[PDB]
Amino acid sequence: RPRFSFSIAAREGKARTGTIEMKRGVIRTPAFMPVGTAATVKALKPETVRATGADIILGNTYHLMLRPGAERIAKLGGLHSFMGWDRPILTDSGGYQVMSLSSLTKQSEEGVTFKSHLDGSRHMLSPERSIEIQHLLGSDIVMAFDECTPYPATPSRAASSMERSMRWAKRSRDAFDSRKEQAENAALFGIQQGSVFENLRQQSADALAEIGFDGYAVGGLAVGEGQDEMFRVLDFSVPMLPDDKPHYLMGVGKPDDIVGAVERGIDMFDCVLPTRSGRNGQAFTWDGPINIRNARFSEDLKPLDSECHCAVCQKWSRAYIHHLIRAGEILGAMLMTEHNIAFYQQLMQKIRDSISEGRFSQFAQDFRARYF
Amino acid sequence: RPRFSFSIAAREGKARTGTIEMKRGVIRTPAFMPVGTAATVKALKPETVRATGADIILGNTYHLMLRPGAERIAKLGGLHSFMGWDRPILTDSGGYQVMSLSSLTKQSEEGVTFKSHLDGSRHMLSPERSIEIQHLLGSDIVMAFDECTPYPATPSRAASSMERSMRWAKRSRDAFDSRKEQAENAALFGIQQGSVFENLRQQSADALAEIGFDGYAVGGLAVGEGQDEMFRVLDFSVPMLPDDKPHYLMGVGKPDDIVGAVERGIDMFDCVLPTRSGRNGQAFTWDGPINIRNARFSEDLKPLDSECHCAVCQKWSRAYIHHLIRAGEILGAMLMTEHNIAFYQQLMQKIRDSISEGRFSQFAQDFRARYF
Numbered sequence: 050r051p052r053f054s055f056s057i058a059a060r061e062g063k064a065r066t067g068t069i070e071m072k073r074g075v076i077r078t079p080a081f082m083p084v085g086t087a088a089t090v091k092a093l094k095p096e097t098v099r100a101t102g103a104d105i106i107l108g109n110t111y112h113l114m115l116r117p118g119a120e121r122i123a124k125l126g127g128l129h130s131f132m133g134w135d136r137p138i139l140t141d142s143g144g145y146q147v148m149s150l151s152s153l154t155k156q157s158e159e160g161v162t163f164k165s166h167l168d169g170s171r172h173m174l175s176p177e178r179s180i181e182i183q184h185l186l187g188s189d190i191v192m193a194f195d196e197c198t199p200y201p202a203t204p205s206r207a208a209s210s211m212e213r214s215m216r217w218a219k220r221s222r223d224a225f226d227s228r229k230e231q232a233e234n235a236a237l238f239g240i241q242q243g244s245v246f247e248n249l250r251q252q253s254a255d256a257l258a259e260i261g262f263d264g265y266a267v268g269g270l271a272v273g274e275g276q277d278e279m280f281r282v283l284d285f286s287v288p289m290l291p292d293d294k295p296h297y298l299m300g301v302g303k304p305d306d307i308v309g310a311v312e313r314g315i316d317m318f319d320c321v322l323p324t325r326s327g328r329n330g331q332a333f334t335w336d337g338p339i340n341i342r343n344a345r346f347s348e349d350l351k352p353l354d355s356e357c358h359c360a361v362c363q364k365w366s367r368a369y370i371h372h373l374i375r376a377g378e379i380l381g382a383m384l385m386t387e388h389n390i391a392f393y394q395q396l397m398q399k400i401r402d403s404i405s406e407g408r409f410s411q412f413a414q415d416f417r418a419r420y421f
Numbered sequence: 422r423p424r425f426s427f428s429i430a431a432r433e434g435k436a437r438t439g440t441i442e443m444k445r446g447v448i449r450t451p452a453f454m455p456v457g458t459a460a461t462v463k464a465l466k467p468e469t470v471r472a473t474g475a476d477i478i479l480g481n482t483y484h485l486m487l488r489p490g491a492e493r494i495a496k497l498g499g500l501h502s503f504m505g506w507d508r509p510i511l512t513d514s515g516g517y518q519v520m521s522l523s524s525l526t527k528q529s530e531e532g533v534t535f536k537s538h539l540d541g542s543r544h545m546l547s548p549e550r551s552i553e554i555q556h557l558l559g560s561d562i563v564m565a566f567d568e569c570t571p572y573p574a575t576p577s578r579a580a581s582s583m584e585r586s587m588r589w590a591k592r593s594r595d596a597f598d599s600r601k602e603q604a605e606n607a608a609l610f611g612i613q614q615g616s617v618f619e620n621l622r623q624q625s626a627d628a629l630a631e632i633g634f635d636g637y638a639v640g641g642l643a644v645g646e647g648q649d650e651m652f653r654v655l656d657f658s659v660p661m662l663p664d665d666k667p668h669y670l671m672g673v674g675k676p677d678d679i680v681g682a683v684e685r686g687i688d689m690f691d692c693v694l695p696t697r698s699g700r701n702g703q704a705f706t707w708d709g710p711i712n713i714r715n716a717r718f719s720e721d722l723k724p725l726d727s728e729c730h731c732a733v734c735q736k737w738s739r740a741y742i743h744h745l746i747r748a749g750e751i752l753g754a755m756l757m758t759e760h761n762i763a764f765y766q767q768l769m770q771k772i773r774d775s776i777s778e779g780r781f782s783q784f785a786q787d788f789r790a791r792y793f
């Protein structure tokens with residue numbers, strides 16, 4: 050296959066369905082990417098992740114550069130080899146988490162300095178170092194290093210951050226291109242910022258398109274602005290991005306959000322909601338999510354979801370999983386996570402199928418009526 | 422298959438190898454039984470447990486009667502259906518754990534009263550109620566309800582407890598036989614007591630043989646007396662039990678203990694050591710156990726064990742598992758537990774093969790030289 054080739058096979062309104070071809074495999078879009086926090090998709094073997102239907106997973110750079118170490122993983126043969134996943138892997142830049150989990154972060158035009166929330170040790174992450182770390186990990190889709198603008202944000206603050214991210218985007222681009230092996234085997238995604246402001250989003254989009262990237266992400270929307278607000282921003286933001294390249298909405302994962310996002314032109318998604326919902330007891334069903342810990346499920350012999358075709362719904366009951374979660378057993382988290390990720394992949398498949406068949410709008414309507 | 426049929430195919434010294442045929446399947450002996458504490462073999466799907474080579478697992482009655490409830494599991498279709506394991510299941514009587522984990526236990530000739538270490542609720546466990554609970558769970562091999570004698574124990578105290586357990590054994594036997602469906606589809610094992618005293622062990626054995634059971638367990642030896650002492654007791658205790666029936670050493674699982682126990686006539690084993698060793702970081706190898714958390718394994722690309730043929734040793738390195746455990750990831754516990762249980766099953770296979778080939782004594786010598 051080629052280094053990177055995105056092809057749109059069908060459309061309906063702003064929705065698109067197609068594929069991204071990469072050296073390690075093909076990614077069907079719209080796509081949902083399970084998240085591997087510390088080089089592991091929580092409670093699942095890589096084969097199980099693939100069995101759910103996932104074509105690609107997301108690796109968190111921040112965590113990896115700390116816990117095991119970028120240099121160490123490279124010496125061990127790279128992330129794919131390390132964790133046993135041989136398909137594409139998209140890694141975030143680490144910038145976001147550094148501004149969330151890290152402590153005593155010092156930001157400048159050069160990058161960000163911070164103390165690990167583990168060893169308390171210091172680190173200086175920059176566009177150049179972020180790109181290098183993602184290379185060391187052997188990432189297939191590299192995210193440009195940026196600064197996620199806090200919500201709410203004033204027009205001036207949002208402008209400054211956006212302008213800086215755009216400057217950092219250029220640096221990421223040049224850093225990526227100078228590394229021959231990386232530039233030739235991996236792809237680079239730029240990230241649009243600008244908060245909820247249209248003019249800022251347009252400037253960011255022009256600058257990003259000006260730089261030129263393999264894909265474009267809509268950043269800064271996984272900040273708690275509400276679905277209505279998020280949708281509003283997506284309405285005018287996605288059209289600004291180049292149409293012939295993937296559109297990746299970072300950190301958005303609720304099912305209804307995904308459907309609405311695809312209706313607005315998004316091709317890629319990622320979220321820990323599915324995995325975290327494995328331990329908290331939240332299981333996704335076509336009739337809406339349920340909390341398996343609820344007493345009403347203690348003797349429910351039915352599977353998590355009546356239609357889901359995942360291995361969990363074929364073999365175990367709600368009653369058993371209810372028991373497992375309340376008892377704090379690891380198997381509970383394993384079964385809940387496999388189901389939820391399988392559910393998500395089934396959702397993406399139904400979206401891809403309905404787009405290819407020109408009945409996505411109807412699917413969305415049907416989905417919402419039942420889900421809510 | 423029959424309700425229960427134990428056949429010895431080969432011998433060497435006191436060691437035996439053969440099979441136990443039961444309705445739900447055949448059990449190869451000597452056998453190692455993975456433990457399912459709360460209706461789950463820690464961090465493993467039933468299929469994975471079977472994939473390691475296990476022919477039977479052990480279910481803990483104490484825990485089950487509390488967390489999910491005996492009556493509830495029966496209404497849900499039984500333990501096999503509940504957890505998804507369709508092969509034989511041996512359940513302990515619950516008496517032991519009640520004297521270990523429980524609180525405010527009141528003991529009498531009728532049974533034992535206690536408060537759950539969970540809800541603090543009270544319960545009265547007796548030979549009759551224990552047998553009933555194991556029936557409700559759908560246990561294939563039922564353990565007689567007894568009183569595990571504390572170590573150290575004076576001759577008089579050990580005698581009284583043993584004599585009482587023998588009285589309880591008769592009650593278990595009658596309770597089991599009165600329940601037609603149970604008596605016809607499940608087996609009942611009596612448990613020998615008597616602490617470290619030969620005459621007490623002999624009395625217990627005669628009484629147990631007098632009652633008549635499908636198998637005989639050597640109880641009271643998983644109390645911290647030391648391998649030397651345990652071996653000493655096994656030397657004169659096992660020969661006391663009927664030769665044509667299985668000999669089950671309860672709670673003994675260290676590899677060297679298993680080998681030495683088989684050399685002394687034991688056919689069945691069980692232990693949480695393998696599972697608990699999954700989280701603590703202890704991995705069994707033919708060169709002795711190792712603690713995967715040790716820094717020397719951070720960049721070790723080799724599998725947990727150079728010879729092990731389990732799925733974990735084929736796919737992941739010590740370096741990766743080292744990372745997983747120190748990072749506290751669920752996958753770490755999953756991989757460590759699959760390997761350790763697979764290692765145990767490989768041990769049992771090597772024991773069965775060496776017995777059938779009349780070279781077990783040599784195998785034991787070779788095993789120890791390398792293991793230690």
Ligand SMILES: CCCCc1nc2c(=O)[nH][nH]c(=O)c2[nH]1
Pocket residue numbers: 141142143144145146192195196197198240267268269270271299300301
């Ligand atoms: C918990 C939600 C994470 C979503 C996210 N947004 C962003 C963004 O806007 N810029 N860069 C990033 O790595 C990033 N990650």
Ligand SMILES: CCCCc1nc2c(=O)[nH][nH]c(=O)c2[nH]1
Pocket residue numbers: 513514515516517518564567568569570612639640641642643671672673
């Ligand atoms: C943690 C070790 C458990 C071993 C055990 N011994 C015994 C025994 O001697 N009698 N009855 C039992 O259930 C039992 N379980």
Ligand SMILES: [Zn+2]
Pocket residue numbers: 353354357358359360361362363388389391392
């Ligand atoms: Zn399912």
Ligand SMILES: [Zn+2]
Pocket residue numbers: 725726729730731732733734735760761763764
């Ligand atoms: Zn192994």
